Design a protein around this nucleic acid. Structure first.
Lengths: 54, 287, 157, 158, 170
RNA sequence: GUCUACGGCCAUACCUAGGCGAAAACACCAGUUCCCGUCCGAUCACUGCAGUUAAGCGUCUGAGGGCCUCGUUAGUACUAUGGUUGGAGACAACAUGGGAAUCCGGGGUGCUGUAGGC
RNA sequence: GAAUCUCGAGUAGAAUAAAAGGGUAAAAGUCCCCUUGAUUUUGAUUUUCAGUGUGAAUACAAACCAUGAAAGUGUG
RNA sequence: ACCUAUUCUCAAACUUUAAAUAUGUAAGACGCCCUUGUCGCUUAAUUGGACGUGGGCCAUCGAAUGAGAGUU
RNA sequence: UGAAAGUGAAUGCAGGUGGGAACGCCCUGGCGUGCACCAUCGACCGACCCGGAAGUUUGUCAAUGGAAGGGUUUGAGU
C-alpha cells in the first residue's frame, strides 16, 4: 500500500495534540519595525522614570 | 422577451448612491481608508459640490454608521458677507472654501495659529507647520464626479481653503493660468480668478460687443448697478469680512411649525381595509 | 403642449462609406470639410473580410456630426433635394430618420444623412453625474417625428 | 493532484450569489488592535493579502497591525501539536468576532451586577447555568379539552 | 447513446382534461433501474393492447420514466425510486378494467416489482377528484388543450377577469 | 414632514404603467470671451438666471414582474448513533437524536446617521 | 434605419496572452496620457513542509522613484 | 423559423437554496474599574497606540463534567 | 568573531519586566524576597551596512589611521 492515513490520528492522540506553551511576553522583534523601534525608546524611558521615582 | 422574470430574479443592484450616480465608491475607498496602525485617527475630507446656483463645501470624516460633518459653508451664506451675485462661479467657490477653512480652524482651535494668506496674490504655497507647535489641520480634497481639468472650480475651492489655513496637499498643475508645457503657474491669472476678474473682462467684452447679451446674462448685476471694476474690491472686502467673523449663524425658522405645515401637504399611506374596499368595488363595477 | 416638449434637431450626421482607402477616402474627406466646415472622422474597419480584402482597423469610411444652425440649413438643402418627400419606413421607431443622396453636386460621391431628434431634457441620459433614464412620456415616437416634420416644413410623408 | 495556493477553491473563494460587485466600506472603517479576536472570511474580489484556504473560517488573535493588513495568530494542527501560524491577512478578509464582543458585554454586565450586589450587601451568583429540567406546573383543561387521536389508515395518495 | 424509446405519449394526447377523469398508474415498488429497451417494449405492448380493445381514441398513455442515466458509452437506463410512477393511463370510468389489465400485462416487460394504483386525482392533474369537481364548479378551471389552467390569487385583475369570466372574485 | 450635500446597511431600495407634487432646494435651461476639451461646448470646462415643472427627482396607485419576511410544504425528504432487525438482494421498518428545499398562501415595497435649507 | 454611424434596450449573456476555476462595470474590460515598483537593502510571514531546502507568494521597514490635483497606489 | 402561458422527466465536474455528522474561537485575575508615567512612533492635538506605575474590585473568579499538568 | 587583514566583551547593584525554589513578616492569604530555569526588552564584543573626530608621517592639499554616532542585520559570543 503506497498511502493511507489509518493509524495516524491514533498516533497523534497517544501523546495528544499538544499546544505550545503560553508566554506573557512575545517577541516585539519579528513584529513591525517602526513599532519595535519606538517601543524600545518608550520602554527605555519608562524603566528610567520608574528608577528616578524610586 | 428582453426583461424576463429570471432576469429580474438574478439582477443584482449597485449600491443606492451608485444607482443615483452620486458616489464614486472606487475613489471613496481610497479617500477614506485610514492606515490601521493609525487606528482611530479620522481622515478629514473637503467635499466640494456644485449645483446650478450654489456651491456646497463640507469637511467630512467617515465612520462605520455614516459620515460626520465637522464644518460647512454654503454659498447662500455669502450674501451675509457681501457677495450677493455670482454665487456659483470660481470666486464663489474660493469664498466658500475660505469660509469652510476658517470655520474648521475655529472649531479645531487652530485659527489663531494658522491664518493662511490674508491677501491672496495667486502664489502657490502650502500652509507650513509650526516648528514648536501643532501641525496644520490636514484635509484632503473630494471632487466627486466633476472632471478635474485645469482651472476647475473644485480646485478653486481648494485654493480658498488652503489659503484659509487648512493644509490641503496639492500642486499648481490644475490652477488657472498654469501652462502644461513650461510647468509654471501664472500668479497674476490666478489672482485674477481669486478676485473675480474673469467675469469682469466678460462684462467688458459683452458691453463692447453685444449689449443685448450683456443685459441677458448679467441682468442681476446690471439691475443692481455694479460694473466690472468693482469686483476686485467687493471680493477683497468679502474675504476680510469672512476672516474677521467666520461663525455660522443658525436660522430662526420654526422647524416644528413648518413640519406641521408640510404634514398637510404630505399625503398619507392608505390602510389595508381600503385595499380590500377598492378591490371588491372594482370587482363589482367590472362584473 | 408644454414648451419644454418641443422637438429640436439634436445633431445631423454626414456619413460617406466608400469601402476603400487611399486618395479616394481623402478626397471624399475634404468634401465633408467643405460641406460642414468641420474636420471629419476616419472610421476604422471593424472586421477582417478577405472577400472584400479588408483588414481590421483600416480607414474605410469618413463621417462628421453637425449641430445647431449649420445642421438645420444642411437639412434644409437635403430636404429641398428630396422635395420634402420621405417614405414611412424612413422614420425610426425611436423617432429618428435618415436618407442617402446619390450625388453631392446639387448641394461623384453618394452619402447618407441621418437626423437625430431629441427634446430638452435628454441631458439626463447623456450626462455623467446623476445619469438617469428619460421618461416614457418625454420620449419621441416615429409618429411625433413625422408630425413635427409635417408642420415645420409642410412636407408630405 | 495539483497543489497550488488556490487549488479546490472554486466554492469557498467564490463570491456569494447577488453579492458580487464592490466591497462595502465599513470594512475599511473598522479598527483592529493587538489582542482582538477576529474571524477570517476570504473575500474573493481582493486577491492581494489572501490567506491560504486553510484559514478561511478560522478564528485567531491579532498580533500585528500594519497600514492595510492585520497579523492573525492561528493554531494549526500539524501531526501531533498545534503550531503557531502568523498570517498577514488584509482587512477585507477579516471581521471582528461577535463572540468576543458578547463576552465583553457579559463581563461589563457581570461587573455591574457585582457592584449592585456589593452595594446592597447581597451575593449574586455570576456563573451561567445549563438549562435545568422543567419545573412542576399545572395545565388547565378549560376550553382546551383533549382530542383523542388514532393513527390514520394507510391510503394511496398518488 | 440513443435511447430505444422515442415516443412517450400515445393515444389521444390532445384529449381534453375533462374528457378522461380516471387515472391509473403503474408504479415501481422497488428502488431499481429500467432499460430503454424495456421501456419501449412495454410501450409497444400497452399501445397494441389498448388500440385493439378500446381503440386509439379511448385512452391517453404517458410513460414517465426517461432513460437519462448512462451505464458504463453503450446505452441509457432509467433510475427509479420507490413509489415513482413508471406508466400512466387516463381514460373514462368505464375503461378502468381495460387499463388495469393493460398495465398488468406490461408489468412482465419491466424488471422488479410494480403496483397498479388507481389514482384518486382527476386525470393527470395534481387535484383530487372532489376538489377538481368543486373548483370546476365555482369556475377557476379552464381547459387548455391537454391540460387545464387554474386561477391563482397572484397576478393582475383584468387579465384574470377576461380569461376567467365565471370566476367569483370575493 | 419635505429638499440638498456626505453617507451606513446595499432591490422592502430594482424594472414597468398610470396619477400627483405648495414653499425652498434640485434639475432641465441661456451662452461660448475666459480656464478647459471635443468631428460636433451635444459630453466635459467656464459665465448666468429668461422660462419649465415636460423629464430627471419625490410620492401614490397595479390582488403588476422581482425582492424581503411569515406560515405551509413538514417533522416530509435527508441524516448521526443502535440492534444476533426484516429481506436472496435491492431496500425497508423500528429505537435514541438532529432536521431541510421547491410549489403554494398571507403580509411588506426601504430604514437610518451627520451637517444644514424650507 | 440611413447608400460604415444612428439611438434604443442591454447584471456582463463580452473581454481579461496562454489550460481550467475564481475575480472584475464611472473596472480589473476598452481607448488616451505619463512612466520603468520588472529598482537597491534587510529581516518577518504563507504554501508544499521534516515546518529542511528549492520554487511561488503575503504583510512591512530603510532608501530611491514613477504617477496623481489629492487620498493613495506601484517591490512585474 | 419562431414567441407566449403551460406540461412529463433528469445531471459527477448545472444551480438560487440547503442540512445531519464533522470544524474554528470564546467562555476573565496575563481579569475588570479608576488614576497616572515613557516614546525618536502616531495625531490638528496628551490626540491615540503599545507598555507601565499607584489604587479599588479580589475565588460563584464568572458554564457542565473529569483529570494533577508540562517541558527537556 | 571573520574568508582574511584584523579587532576583541560593565551606561546600571554586571540592567528591566513576567512567572518562580527557599526564607522573613503579618492575619489562610497578604506582604516582602527571589536562587534555578524559561518568555521577553535592552546594554556590550566581532562581522555586515553606513559615518569619517582625533591622531601618525609620507605624499600635509594629502597619505595613513581609525573615535563618536547610527542600522533593528548577523555569530557555534560577553
Amino acid at each position: 500500500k503506497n498511502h493511507t492515513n489509518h493509524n495516524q490520528n491514533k498516533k497523534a492522540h497517544r501523546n495528544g495534540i499538544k499546544r505550545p506553551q503560553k508566554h506573557r511576553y512575545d517577541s516585539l522583534k519579528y513584529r513591525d519595525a517602526k513599532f519595535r523601534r519606538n517601543q524600545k525608546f518608550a520602554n527605555r524611558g519608562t524603566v528610567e522614570a520608574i528608577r528616578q521615582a524610586k | 422577451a428582453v426583461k424576463s422574470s429570471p432576469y429580474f430574479s438574478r439582477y443584482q443592484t449597485k449600491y443606492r448612491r451608485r444607482r443615483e450616480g452620486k458616489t464614486d465608491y472606487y475613489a471613496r475607498k481610497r479617500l477614506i481608508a485610514q492606515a490601521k496602525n493609525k487606528y482611530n485617527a479620522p481622515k478629514y475630507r473637503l467635499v466640494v459640490r456644485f449645483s446650478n446656483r450654489f456651491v456646497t463645501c463640507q469637511i467630512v470624516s467617515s465612520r462605520v454608521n455614516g459620515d460626520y460633518v465637522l464644518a460647512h459653508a454654503h454659498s447662500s451664506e455669502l450674501p451675509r458677507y457681501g457677495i450677493k451675485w455670482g454665487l456659483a462661479n470660481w470666486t464663489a467657490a474660493y469664498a466658500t472654501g475660505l469660509l469652510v477653512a476658517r470655520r474648521a480652524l475655529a472649531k479645531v482651535g487652530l485659527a489663531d495659529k494658522y491664518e493662511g494668506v490674508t491677501e491672496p496674490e495667486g502664489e502657490f504655497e502650502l500652509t507650513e507647520a509650526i516648528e514648536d507647535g501643532p501641525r496644520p489641520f490636514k484635509v484632503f480634497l473630494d471632487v466627486g464626479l466633476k472632471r478635474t481639468s485645469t482651472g476647475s472650480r473644485v480646485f478653486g475651492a481648494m485654493k480658498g481653503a488652503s489659503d484659509g489655513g487648512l493644509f490641503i496637499p496639492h500642486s499648481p498643475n490644475r490652477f488657472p493660468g498654469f501652462d502644461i508645457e513650461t510647468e509654471e503657474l501664472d500668479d497674476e491669472t490666478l489672482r485674477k480668478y481669486i478676485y473675480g476678474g474673469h467675469v469682469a473682462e466678460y462684462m467688458e467684452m459683452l458691453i463692447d460687443d453685444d449689449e443685448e447679451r450683456y443685459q441677458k446674462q448679467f441682468s442681476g448685476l446690471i439691475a443692481d448697478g455694479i460694473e466690472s471694476d468693482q469686483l476686485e474690491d467687493i471680493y477683497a472686502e468679502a474675504y476680510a469680512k469672512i476672516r474677521e467673523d467666520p461663525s455660522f449663524q443658525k436660522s430662526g425658522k420654526d422647524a416644528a411649525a413648518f413640519k406641521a405645515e408640510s404634514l398637510k401637504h404630505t399625503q398619507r399611506k392608505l390602510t389595508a381595509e381600503e385595499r380590500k374596499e377598492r378591490f371588491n368595488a372594482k370587482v363589482i363595477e367590472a362584473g | 403642449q408644454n414648451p419644454m416638449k418641443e422637438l429640436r434637431i439634436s445633431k445631423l450626421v454626414l456619413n460617406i462609406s466608400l469601402g476603400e482607402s487611399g486618395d479616394r477616402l481623402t478626397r471624399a474627406a475634404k468634401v465633408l470639410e467643405q460641406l460642414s466646415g468641420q474636420t471629419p472622422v476616419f472610421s476604422k474597419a471593424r472586421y477582417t473580410i478577405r472577400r472584400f480584402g479588408i483588414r481590421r482597423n483600416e480607414k474605410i469610411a469618413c463621417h462628421v456630426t453637425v449641430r445647431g444652425p449649420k445642421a438645420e440649413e444642411i437639412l434644409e438643402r437635403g430636404l429641398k433635394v428630396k422635395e420634402y418627400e420621405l417614405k414611412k419606413r424612413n422614420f425610426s421607431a425611436t423617432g429618428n430618420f435618415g436618407f442617402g443622396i446619390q450625388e453631392h453636386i446639387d448641394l461623384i460621391y453618394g452619402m447618407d444623412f441621418y437626423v437625430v431628434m431629441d427634446r430638452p431634457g435628454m441631458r439626463v441620459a447623456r450626462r455623467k453625474a446623476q445619469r438617469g433614464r428619460v421618461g416614457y412620456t418625454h420620449k419621441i415616437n416615429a409618429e411625433d417625428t413625422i408630425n413635427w416634420f409635417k408642420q415645420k416644413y409642410d412636407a408630405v410623408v | 493532484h495539483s497543489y497550488g495556493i488556490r487549488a479546490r477553491t472554486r466554492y469557498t473563494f467564490q463570491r456569494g450569489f447577488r453579492e458580487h460587485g464592490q466591497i462595502r466600506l465599513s470594512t475599511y472603517l473598522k479598527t483592529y488592535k493587538v489582542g482582538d479576536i477576529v474571524d477570517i472570511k476570504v473575500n474573493g474580489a481582493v486577491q492581494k493579502g489572501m490567506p491560504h484556504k486553510y484559514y478561511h473560517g478560522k478564528t485567531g488573535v491579532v498580533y500585528n497591525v500594519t497600514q492595510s493588513s492585520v497579523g492573525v495568530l492561528i493554531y494549526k494542527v500539524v501531526g501531533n501539536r498545534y503550531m503557531e501560524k502568523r498570517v498577514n491577512v488584509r482587512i477585507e478578509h477579516v471581521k471582528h468576532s461577535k463572540c468576543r464582543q458578547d463576552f465583553l458585554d457579559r463581563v461589563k454586565a457581570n461587573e455591574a451586577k457585582r457592584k449592585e450586589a456589593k452595594a446592597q450587601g447581597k451575593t449574586v451568583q455570576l456563573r451561567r447555568q445549563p438549562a435545568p429540567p422543567a419545573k412542576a406546573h399545572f395545565v388547565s383543561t378549560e376550553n382546551n379539552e383533549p382530542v383523542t387521536l388514532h393513527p390514520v389508515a394507510y391510503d394511496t395518495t398518488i | 447513446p440513443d435511447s430505444k424509446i422515442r415516443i412517450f405519449d400515445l393515444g389521444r394526447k390532445r384529449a381534453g382534461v375533462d374528457e378522461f377523469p380516471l387515472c391509473i398508474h403503474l408504479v415501481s415498488n422497488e428502488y431499481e433501474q429500467i432499460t430503454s429497451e424495456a421501456l419501449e417494449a412495454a410501450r409497444i405492448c400497452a399501445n397494441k393492447y389498448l388500440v385493439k380493445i378500446g381503440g386509439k381514441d379511448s385512452f391517453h398513455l404517458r410513460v414517465r420514466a426517461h432513460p437519462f442515466h448512462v451505464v458504463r458509452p453503450n446505452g441509457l437506463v432509467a433510475r427509479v425510486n420507490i413509489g415513482q410512477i413508471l406508466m400512466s393511463v387516463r381514460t373514462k370510468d368505464s375503461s378502468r378494467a381495460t387499463a388495469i389489465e393493460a398495465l398488468r400485462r406490461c408489468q412482465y416487460k419491466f424488471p422488479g416489482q410494480q403496483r397498479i394504483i388507481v389514482s384518486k386525482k382527476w386525470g393527470f392533474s395534481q387535484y383530487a377528484r372532489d376538489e377538481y369537481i368543486e373548483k370546476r364548479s365555482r369556475g377557476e378551471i379552464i381547459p387548455d388543450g391537454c391540460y387545464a389552467k387554474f386561477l391563482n390569487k397572484r397576478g393582475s385583475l383584468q387579465e384574470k377577469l377576461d380569461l376567467f369570466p365565471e370566476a367569483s372574485f370575493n
